[PDB]
Design goal:
homodimer; 115 residues; mainly alpha; two-stranded antiparallel sheet; 4 helices; 56% helix; signal (chains A, B); Interleukin-2 (chains A, B); cytokine
Chain lengths: 115, 115
């Protein structure tokens, strides 16, 4: 596991998670992927699309943490492999508020480094 | 291959190798370990050790780039292993000017991310 990258994601997820809520409409709801073994690659494509959604509806400019999280998600090469990979649709995930969206985003990124 | 960490090195190396020379005495010299297959581990410890000799020779006691470089090396877990490993001696390497030192250093980190 690349400790250098997990450490930047740690700093970036702490600074980004703290300012949000108050930076977004309470009415903002985002699709929040889980860590089901056979859909991690879907789960990552959906986390990325909805970060974009979080962009256009939130006062997140120009967050150093946000564009670190975002560009990190698109360039890092994760092990998204399993016995039986499947496709999952973004809109079939739960919506939730911003605080739990990145929280779940963190948990997913950690899982990916764990393997 | 951890593209997030490699890009943080790349930028930190470019934003340092290009500023340096100007930031050190023209007569500064450093021992520059190379990438012999069986001396990777040594080569790492001497690189870190001459970073310190460069920390008092020049400014760089601060510097976002220098700290990221230095901290990356002591905390990232490397595959420095071989079938016939050997203990190299830092002062048995070639001494070089500060800019070439960081170039070789960039070459040693690229190699260890390739394996």
């Amino acid at each position: 596991r690349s400790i250098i990258a997990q450490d930047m994601f740690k700093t970036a997820f702490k600074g980004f998670k703290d300012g949000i809520s108050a930076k977004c409409p309470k009415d903002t709801r985002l699709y929040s992927p889980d860590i089901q073994e056979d859909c991690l690659s879907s789960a990552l494509k959906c986390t990325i699309a909805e970060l974009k959604v979080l962009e256009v509806e939130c006062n997140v400019t120009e967050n150093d943490d946000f564009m670190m999280i975002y560009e990190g998600l698109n360039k890092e090469k994760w092990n998204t492999s399993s016995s039986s990979p499947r496709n999952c649709t973004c809109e079939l995930y739960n919506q939730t508020h911003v605080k739990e969206f990145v929280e779940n985003m963190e948990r997913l990124v950690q899982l990916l480094y764990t393997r």
